[PDB]
Design a protein around this ligand. Sequence first.
Ligand code: PLP
Ligand code: PLP
Ligand code: CL
Ligand code: ZN
Ligand code: ZN
Lengths: 367, 367
Amino acid sequence: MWLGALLDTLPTPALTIDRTTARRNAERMRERCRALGVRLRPHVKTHKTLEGGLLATGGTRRGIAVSTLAEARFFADGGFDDILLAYPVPTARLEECAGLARRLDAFHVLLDRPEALASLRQRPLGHGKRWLVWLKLDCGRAGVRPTDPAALELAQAIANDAPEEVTLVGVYAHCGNTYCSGADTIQAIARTTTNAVLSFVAALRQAGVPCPQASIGSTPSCSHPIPEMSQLTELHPGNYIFYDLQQTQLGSCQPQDVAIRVLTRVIGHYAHRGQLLVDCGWAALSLHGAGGPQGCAAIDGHPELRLVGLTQEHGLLEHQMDFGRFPVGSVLALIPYHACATAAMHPVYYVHEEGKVVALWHPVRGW
Amino acid sequence: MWLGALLDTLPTPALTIDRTTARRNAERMRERCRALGVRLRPHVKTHKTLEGGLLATGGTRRGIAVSTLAEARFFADGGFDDILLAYPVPTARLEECAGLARRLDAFHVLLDRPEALASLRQRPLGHGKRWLVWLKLDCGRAGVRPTDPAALELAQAIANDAPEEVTLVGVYAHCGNTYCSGADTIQAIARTTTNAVLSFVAALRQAGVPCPQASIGSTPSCSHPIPEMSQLTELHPGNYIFYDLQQTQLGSCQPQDVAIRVLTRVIGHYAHRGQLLVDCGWAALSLHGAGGPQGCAAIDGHPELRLVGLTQEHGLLEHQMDFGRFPVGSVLALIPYHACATAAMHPVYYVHEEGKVVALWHPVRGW
Ligand SMILES: *Cc1c(COP(=O)(O)O)cnc(C)c1O
Ligand SMILES: *Cc1c(COP(=O)(O)O)cnc(C)c1O
Ligand SMILES: [Cl-]
Ligand SMILES: [Zn+2]
Ligand SMILES: [Zn+2]
């Protein structure tokens, strides 16, 4: 137990979350959605914690998206509901999906293939419940292309072919392609996606296919929303609760919006090479940002320094260095490239305010 | 509980370990060391499990190397002893190190700085125990260069300056630089390292510095050992228990020596792009091998296929494809680039023999 502890006191490497910053990020996204007239369904995959979920959800524990059944189960067990499995429904795991649909007032699934609908049909929920299905739109990884006649036909089938067993809740797009720098290009992807979705829904209405909801979002696009988004019903970003270096470089946020660090101690000086040795390796950071290591993290408040090497449990920093500025034992705060990836390496996050630990959040992991 | 289950039955993505292969790998390294007349101190960081430790150690639970205090504690609690913390000793965590030194018959630490020795001196163990110290030799990340006069002086200090509180057990080098392809260049690094170590120890003997042990090793060098190694006392490879694609490419092993897979299900076909969608993203694999994604894994038994994309929970495979060869629902076995990195993403390993799960191993993680 580390409650009350000063940050420089923590065992490193340590993932830290500034709760003032995270709370602010959570509330700001809630406000953007309120201003647009749309609901927020935060994706939880960046943190995978009940505590982060509670913040993102403004205390309601209702209305989230998850990336795995491990998360769906974990959040369900933590008293959340209105949980969307934002993943082509795992037809090999339908018994588990149906278990969740039966426990929850609203467990939502996505699909983009007729065979998946067929699988849902041959595993009815019973219990007076319907599979709550969203059609995933590809506007380029999963989903159906909205201009593909197949898309409209699949929507029709989801909506009307077995109204007693399955229902079409809405369409769902994830504009993951926003990960092009600049507000202008981000907003362009947002607009193509938004308009493609809106045009598809308009086609659905004309074809008499009821589609009450329409959900898009990624952190870049929801950090600089466009007015066209007010014609949707819901936005589902997730990374924004923490942000990270990549989002900062993308222009999604300012450095002050990044809640996450990895704290690391200088554990050695190697003058013959001009390097600091730190106790944060890829086990604490991941290699996200390297495709080299310089791209994986910046040192907060120290532009002079750069990561030049990562092994499992060690990192090497280079400036000509200044070894008196960085005694062995000093603590540096790394700003990670990708919060989701870095958070996935940590069994605990030390959540702080005013320099002191205020909470410990423990994420779920696995599948 | 999945004991007895057929592999195609597991929830994917699933890290699987062929126990016949792992056991064979464990026994083979033990035999190489026996043939050389040296001890084996397996490093556990590739698997971080008590079960893997028991295999590597030939059932003794004695004589391992670990990369973190989390591992030292976990293995100590699992009844292991003669545990070496193969890491410049964490002078900010000395109370924890001393706790371990006090519980264990033999907890070993490494250092390469006089200040670290000074820290050990100002935190005596008491209890009739001595800090068991190895001098880390850099023959290029941590350690002292053996030709650096400072090295000999630090060895002298460790050995003789407070014989009641601190003792020099031996010198420790990790020829991590073997990670240059080919047996010839691997063995060259092994030889430079081995000879540098042997020359340093010879210098120590001439200077009257007692140094009873001398430990080197990496998986590449211990997979093709050289006779000069018989002049050492111990070898400390670790990855070999599983091996991986990188070691296969390095020539350390044959494909048949790789015990580890990540099983993944085909979850979609996207003909308009010629791609299979699988349920293994970087959350199950890591991005090791990308610095792109094609380098992170091969598909076992399917040279035709290649990873072209990884998101957190999805992967994209490309051949012109053949969608009938790979129905949605089929299970493919990914051979990961770096076992250590992939294993760090999994809360459980499904260990199998003759196609069926035989054990579940749960690794420790964190710091
Ligand atoms: C990650 C994800 C989101 C949230 O996007 P971010 O840009 O990470 O905030 C929404 N939908 C899906 C399907 C996702 O995978
Ligand atoms: C990883 C490691 C080893 C084991 O080396 P492998 O090539 O991974 O088998 C030995 N010593 C140290 C210090 C290590 O970090
Ligand atoms: Cl990674
Ligand atoms: Zn992300
Ligand atoms: Zn490794």
